[PDB]
């Protein structure tokens with residue numbers, strides 16, 4: 001059965017830093033963008049919406065715009081990686097990564113931000 | 118863009134009655150069982166795991182085992198229909214139906230159970 005996995009299901013980070021939430025999925029030989037879908041959401045806020053290689057700035061929630069990107073370099077090697085930069089205390093919470101690729105699966109990732117000084 | 122739709126996001130049903138939760142996806146004609154995944158969750162309790170035709174009925178909350186069924190007769194009309202016979206008060210809460218077909222989407226449905234006397 002297709003099982004997405006999370007190396008680290010608990011990221012503690014510092015206010016203002018850079019964070020990279022990883023989700024991994026199985027890839028045999030190369031990666032087929034046809035039949036790959038990657039969706040990242042926090043508390044129902046749309047963070048990453050990647051469908052057969054197309055993405056649209058218009059659908060990103062306003063608190064994640066210009067900070068939250070899906071790294072395409074890791075994707076090619078089975079790693080849906082969310083990278084939030086300039087982290088706010090408001091980014092603390094449970095995130096879900098939902099992948100369709102051979103089959104489907106999702107995983108929760110928890111994040112706390114410790115506060116400045 | 119592939120979108121899942123609920124004719125109703127909230128159902129009020131009576132203790133002891135039968136209830137069908139419906140969530141619809143688009144279908145051209147020949148249902149490609151090979152391209153279809155239907156997953157039903159209730160508070161993260163795996164209810165339905167239906168993947169390329171086969172149900173891993175191993176993992177199915179015994180809370181619903183033999184009472185929570187995927188009507189695999191409406192799927193062909195683009196209706197992932199969850200039916201729970203003999204509704205207990207425990208069946209009250211938020212259900213989530215996740216479909217991967219052309220692409221992918223999910224929707225929440227709430228169930229309020231009442232028991233008039």
Ligand SMILES: CC(=O)NCCNCc1cc(C)c(OCc2cccc(-c3cccc(COc4cc(OCc5cncc(C#N)c5)c(CNCCNC(C)=O)cc4C)c3C)c2C)cc1OCc1cncc(C#N)c1
Nearest residue numbers: 003039098099100104107108156215216217221222224225
């Ligand atoms: C204009 C337009 O309206 N368009 C789109 C509009 N929205 C944009 C959008 C746009 C897009 C693209 C998307 O994609 C999702 C997506 C992406 C990728 C995959 C899936 C998906 C599809 C089918 C099934 C499943 C999940 O199956 C399973 C889950 C399972 O269980 C996982 C699990 C269970 N329990 C706890 C955890 C944890 N932790 C994990 C298991 C069993 N396990 C694995 C197997 N065995 C082992 C060893 O594990 C099996 C299946 C098949 C998923 C995630 C989904 C839904 C979702 C989208 O909106 C979501 C959304 C946003 N806001 C509000 C609501 C509401 N209401 C909904």
